Write a protein that binds this ligand. Structure first.
Ligand SMILES: CC(=O)Nc1nc2ncc(C=O)nc2c(=O)[nH]1
Lengths: 383, 97, 268
C-alpha cells in the first residue's frame, strides 16, 4: 500500500486477547492457549470512500468497539501501522474471524532474553491465514530486588485493572500463506516498523525445508546480498513502515517450504513465518490405437506437481449402465526439464457390439475442474 | 496417507531363453504397510521383499524382487498392496525390451 | 557422507500399523535396526558387528528401550496438545553430513501425520514452526534455554563423532564403486510418437547423469528423467529418454557419465 497520505480517519478496535494457562495447561508443555482473558487496543486508519460519518467509519465494524472490558491493554502506538491499516477491514470483507494473544519476555528458570524487565509481546492474526502482526511492547514498571514484579501475566493478567503498554517495534505481513506454480517467479510479503528511538541492523530471509532452515537472502547496513536467490529494495526511512519483501526468480522443487522474514534491530528482534506452496496443473493427451480386435487406449498426463496425479478410466455405453474402470494400469513416472512430473496410463478397450465411449479422467489439487480426454472405439464390424 | 510411488525394472536386460531377475521399487509411502507382488501374465511368481527404509521426506523406501524367465511372448506386471488404500496400485512393465 | 537416525511410532496404533521403529543409516546402506517387538538392537552391517562389542549392543538396546517408552509418553502428550481423541502418527529425524571441504552440517525435524511440525536451526539457535501447536511448542522450547547447548551438540557433536567412526569401521566396504552399463533402444509410448530410451544400471554410488545430443548440438525438446532405482546387488539403476517427432530423421548420441567414466554411443 502507498503511504496513507490521502483521506482517512483513525478508529478504535478491540480484539479478544488470549492468554496461556502457564502451569495449568491442557497439555504438558506450552506457551500458548486459545482462551480469552482480556482484550487489546488496536488502531486502524483505513482510506475513506464515502466519509458518511465525517470523522469515523464502520469499515472495521466487525472488530470496532467503544466498550472497554475490565481488562484491556493500551498498546500505545509509537510506530507506523499503515501497512495493516485496512487489515481488519479486509478480514471483515472476507468474514474472517480475528483474534489476538498476549505473552511475556520474562524467564524465571533461566536468563531473561530481554534482561529481566517488564517487556511483553502481543500478536494479532486473521483466521484463515490472513494478515498477521507481532507487537513488541514495554510496561513502565520499576524494580530493584524483586523477582516477580512485571507482573508476568500469569495466571491472572493483573491483581487489578491493567498495566500500561506501548509498542516500540513490530513485524507484520499481509498473509501467512503463499501459493505459486513450479517454474514460475514468486515473492515474499512482509514488513516492519519501529519508534524513532530504535535503529535497524539487518534483515534476513530464510527457507524452512529438508530438516534445516537456510539463508536465501540478507540485507545488512544498506547492502543487499543473495546467497541462493532473490532481490530486495532499500528499507524505508523513519516516518513510514519499512518493507521486508523478497523477489524470487522462478521457483523449483527445492524452494518449496516455509519462509521466515527476520528483522533485527539495535535492541530487539522479531519475525513472521509464511508458508509457500508450489503446484503445477496436469496436461492430458489421448489417442486410440488403430485396428486390433481390442484397440488400446493410450493417455499421457504431464507437467504436474507434486508427483503421482490420480488417474481413473471411465467406460460408457449407448445406454445400459455406464461404470468406472478399476483396472487399466500406469507406468513411467518421471520428471521433466521444468522439474514437473509426468506419468503414462493405458487401457485395453472393448469396442462393444455397437460402439463404446472411453474417458481418461485426471484428479489433482491444482485442478479447479476435472481434467481428462475422451475417445470413441469402433468395432471392426462397425467400420 | 502417502500413496506409494512405483516403478518396475529388470536387473539385467531380459532376453528369450536367458533367465533373469525382476525388481520393483516402491517409494514415498506411509505408513510403511506395503506388500509387493510381482506377476507373470497376471499370475504371482516367486518373489522376495526386503527391508523398509526411512526417507528424509517423512516416507519410506521398499525394494522387492522376483525370479523369472524372459519371454517376448509373455507380459509382466506388478501390484502393490497398501493397508490404508481401498485398492492396490497396478503398474505395467515394458519388459525392458 | 551421510549419517541418519530415525524414530517413528503411532499414538494408539490402529490397523496393524507399526507401534515403534528405530533405524540408523550411513551413506547408502543401513548400519543398524531396532526391533520394538523383541526389543533388541541388531546390526545391518558386518563391520558394525565387528567394531561394536556385545557389551555395547546390550547397553544400546537398553537405552533404546528407554527411548521407546518415553516416546509413547510423548505421543499421548501430543494428543492433548492437538486435542485429538483419535489415532495419529508422529515421527522425528536427525542426522549429519560431512563435506569434502572438511566442513560439517546436520538437521533435526519433527512431523505430525506426515506434516512438518518443527525444525531446529542450530545456527540461529531457534525453532521453526508451521501449525498452531508447533507455534505453541516453539515458544515453549525456545524459552527454555537449557536445551540450547544440548540441541546444538545433539546435531553436531554426537552425530559427527559417530559418522567419522562409522566411516573408519566400514572403510573396507564404504569405498566401493562401480561403473555403469548402458543400453539404448527405441520404443512407442504414444501413437504417432517415438521414444528414445536409455537404461543405465550396475553403478555405485549413484553419481550418474545421462544426456543427449542432436546432430552434434544440444537437444531442444523436453527430456524424461528417471530416479535412482536399487538393483539389490549393492548398485543402482537410472534412465533418461527423449521424445522424437514422427518426422525426426535426425541422428542422436547418448552420453552417460558416472565416476569419471564417460561413454558416448555413436548409434543405436
Ligand atoms: C541424544 C541422542 O538422542 N542421540 C542419539 N544417539 C544415538 N546413539 C545411537 C543410536 C543407535 O543405536 N541412535 C542414537 C540416536 O538416535 N540419537
Amino acid at each position: 500500500p502507498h503511504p496513507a497520505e490521502g483521506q482517512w480517519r483513525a478508529v478504535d478496535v478491540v480484539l479478544d486477547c488470549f492468554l496461556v494457562k502457564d502451569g495449568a495447561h491442557r497439555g504438558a508443555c506450552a506457551s500458548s492457549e486459545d482462551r480469552a482473558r482480556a482484550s487489546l487496543v488496536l488502531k486502524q486508519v483505513p482510506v475513506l470512500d464515502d466519509g458518511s460519518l465525517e470523522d469515523f467509519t464502520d469499515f472495521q465494524g466487525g472488530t470496532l468497539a467503544q466498550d472497554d472490558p475490565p481488562i484491556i491493554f493500551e498498546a500505545s502506538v509509537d510506530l507506523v501501522q499503515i501497512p495493516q491499516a485496512e487489515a481488519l477491514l479486509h478480514a471483515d470483507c472476507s468474514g474472517k474471524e480475528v483474534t489476538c494473544e498476549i505473552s511475556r519476555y520474562f524467564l524465571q528458570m533461566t536468563e531473561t532474553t530481554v534482561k529481566t524487565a517488564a517487556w511483553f509481546m502481543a500478536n494479532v492474526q486473521v483466521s484463515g491465514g490472513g494478515p498477521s502482526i507481532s507487537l513488541v511492547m514495554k510496561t513502565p514498571r520499576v524494580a530493584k530486588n524483586e523477582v516477580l514484579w512485571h507482573p508476568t501475566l500469569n495466571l491472572p493478567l493483573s491483581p487489578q485493572g491493567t498495566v500500561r503498554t506501548a509498542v516500540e517495534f513490530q513485524v507484520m505481513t499481509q498473509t501467512q500463506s503463499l501459493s505459486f506454480l513450479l517454474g514460475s517467479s514468486a515473492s515474499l510479503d512482509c514488513g516492519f516498523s519501529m519508534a524513532p528511538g530504535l535503529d535497524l541492523i539487518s534483515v534476513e530471509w530464510r527457507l524452512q525445508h529438508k530438516g534445516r532452515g537456510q539463508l536465501v537472502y540478507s540485507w545488512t547496513a544498506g547492502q543487499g546480498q543473495a546467497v541462493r536467490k532473490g532481490a530486495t529494495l532499500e528499507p524505508a526511512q523513519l516516518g513510514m513502515a519499512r518493507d521486508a519483501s523478497l523477489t524470487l526468480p522462478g521457483l523449483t522443487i527445492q524452494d518449496e517450504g516455509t519462509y521466515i522474514c527476520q528483522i533485527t534491530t539495535s535492541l530487539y528482534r522479531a519475525q513472521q513465518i509464511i508458508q509457500l506452496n508450489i503446484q503445477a496443473s496436469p496436461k492430458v493427451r489421448l489417442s486410440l490405437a488403430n485396428e486390433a480386435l481390442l484397440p488400446t487406449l493410450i493417455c499421457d498426463i504431464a507437467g504436474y506437481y507434486p508427483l503421482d496425479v490420480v488417474v481413473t478410466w471411465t467406460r460408457e455405453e449407448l445406454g445400459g449402465s455406464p461404470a468406472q474402470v478399476s483396472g487399466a494400469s500406469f507406468s513411467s513416472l518421471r520428471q521433466s526439464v521444468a522439474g514437473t512430473y509426468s506419468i503414462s496410463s493405458s487401457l485395453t478397450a472393448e469396442p462393444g457390439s455397437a460402439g463404446a465411449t472411453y474417458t481418461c479422467q485426471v484428479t489433482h489439487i491444482s485442478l479447479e475442474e476435472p481434467l481428462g480426454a475422451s475417445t470413441q472405439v469402433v468395432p471392426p464390424e462397425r467400420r | 496417507q502417502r500413496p506409494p510411488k512405483i516403478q518396475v525394472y529388470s536387473r539385467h536386460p531380459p532376453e528369450d531363453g536367458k533367465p533373469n531377475y525382476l525388481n520393483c521399487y516402491v517409494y514415498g509411502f506411509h505408513p510403511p504397510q506395503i506388500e509387493i507382488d510381482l506377476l507373470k501374465n497376471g499370475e504371482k511368481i516367486k518373489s522376495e521383499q526386503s527391508d523398509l527404509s526411512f526417507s528424509k521426506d517423512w516416507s519410506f523406501y521398499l525394494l522387492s524382487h522376483a525370479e523369472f524367465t524372459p519371454n517376448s511372448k509373455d507380459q509382466y506386471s506388478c501390484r502393490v498392496k497398501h493397508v490404508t488404500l481401498e485398492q492396490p496400485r497396478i503398474v505395467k512393465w515394458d519388459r525392458d525390451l | 557422507h551421510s549419517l541418519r537416525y530415525f524414530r517413528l511410532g503411532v499414538s494408539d496404533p490402529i490397523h496393524g500399523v507399526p507401534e515403534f521403529i528405530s533405524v540408523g543409516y550411513v551413506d547408502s546402506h543401513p548400519i543398524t535396526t531396532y526391533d520394538s517387538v523383541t526389543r533388541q538392537k541388531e546390526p545391518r552391517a558386518p563391520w558394525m558387528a565387528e567394531n561394536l562389542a556385545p557389551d555395547h549392543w546390550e547397553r544400546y538396546t537398553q537405552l533404546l528401550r528407554g527411548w521407546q517408552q518415553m516416546f509413547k509418553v510423548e505421543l499421548k502428550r501430543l494428543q492433548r496438545h492437538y486435542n485429538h481423541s483419535g489415532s495419529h502418527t508422529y515421527q522425528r529425524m536427525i542426522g549429519c553430513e560431512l563435506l569434502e571441504d572438511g566442513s560439517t552440517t546436520g538437521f533435526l525435524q519433527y512431523a505430525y501425520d506426515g506434516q512438518d511440525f518443527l525444525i531446529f536451526n542450530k545456527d540461529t539457535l531457534s525453532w521453526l514452526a508451521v501449525d498452531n501447536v508447533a507455534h505453541t511448542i516453539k515458544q515453549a522450547w525456545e524459552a527454555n534455554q537449557h536445551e540450547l547447548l544440548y540441541q546444538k551438540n545433539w546435531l553436531e557433536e554426537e552425530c559427527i563423532a559417530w559418522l567419522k567412526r562409522f566411516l573408519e569401521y566400514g572403510k573396507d566396504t564404504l569405498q566401493r564403486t562401480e561403473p555403469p552399463k548402458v543400453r539404448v533402444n527405441h520404443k512407442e509410448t504414444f501413437p504417432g510418437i517415438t521414444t528414445l530410451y536409455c537404461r543405465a544400471y550396475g553403478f555405485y554410488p549413484p553419481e550418474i547423469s545421462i544426456n543427449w545430443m542432436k546432430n552434434g548440438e544440444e537437444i531442444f525438446q523436453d527430456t524424461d528423467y528417471g530416479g535412482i532405482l536399487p538393483s539389490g546387488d549393492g548398485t543402482y539403476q537410472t534412465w533418461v529418454s527423449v521424445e522424437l517427432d514422427p518426422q525426426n530423421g535426425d541422428i542422436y548420441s547418448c552420453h552417460v557419465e558416472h565416476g569419471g567414466v564417460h561413454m558416448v554411443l555413436q548409434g543405436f
